Structure 1
């Protein structure tokens, strides 16, 4: 009767490559949207008092991403990481990432 709070947790799975190379897995390769590291999606836990509403993590194909959910970029000095992502793969693109989301909630009473 008091309602609930809702929060969609968002994390990004990251891959890199050398031009002419292949897309490859890394260690802890998960970051937030700005590229700062975070736990791998499957290790993420609700804060105390919260519960998952979605049973599974999902990736949203309506955003500007390809058919597998990836968006693409390259690192342009002076920067040390990609800043601008695009939906379409091209041979000179060296980074890609995929956005995973999951809804959790907290009942207010």
Structure 2
């Protein structure tokens, strides 16, 4: 569960723990495997043990014995109520606290 990250490598929740924000409904209740990336048929990309920078630079679709990490991108969609976006500014005032 600690292997879920954002684009910057920062920890995020597991894909199955994500809920839809107020004023929005899910278009996709489940996460779709991203096959649009340089990944294998299972959506996985592979890489060498993460270097000292702790910020891995290279991933490939290929599986090798050299690779000790594997990653997938997941895609999920949501749609807003077709009324007003005034509600969207109500939960975005707390940028930091």
The C-alpha deviation readout for 1:65-91, integer Å capped at 9, x for no partner, is: 011110011245441132221111111
Query: Who is 1:50 aligned against?
Result: 24
Larger Rg: 2
TM-score using structure 2 length = 0.73
The C-alpha deviation readout for 1:9-67, integer Å capped at 9, x for no partner, is: xxxxxxxxxxxxxxxxxx43211122211111111111222110113211022321011
TM-score using structure 1 length = 0.66
- Higher helix fraction: Structure 1 or Structure 2? 2
Answer yes or no: is the 8 Å Cα contact 1:58–1:102 preserved in 2. Answer: yes
Change (3 A) 1:46 1:55: closer
Q: Work out the CA distance in 1 between the residues paired with 2:76 and 2:23.
A: 16
Change (3 A) 1:90 1:54: same
Measured on the aligned residues, the alpha-carbon RMSD in Å equals 1.8
**Tell me, what secondary structure is at the counterpart of 2:16?**
helix
Unpaired runs of at least 5, structure 1? 1-26
Higher relative contact order (Cα pairs below 8 Å, separated by 6+ residues):
1
1:101 Cα deviation after fit: 1.0
Q: Work out the CA distance in 2 between the residues paired with 1:73 and 1:34.
A: 16
Change (3 A) 1:84 1:42: same
Q: 2:70 aligns with which of 84, 93, 96?
A: 96
How many aligned residue pairs are there? Answer: 83
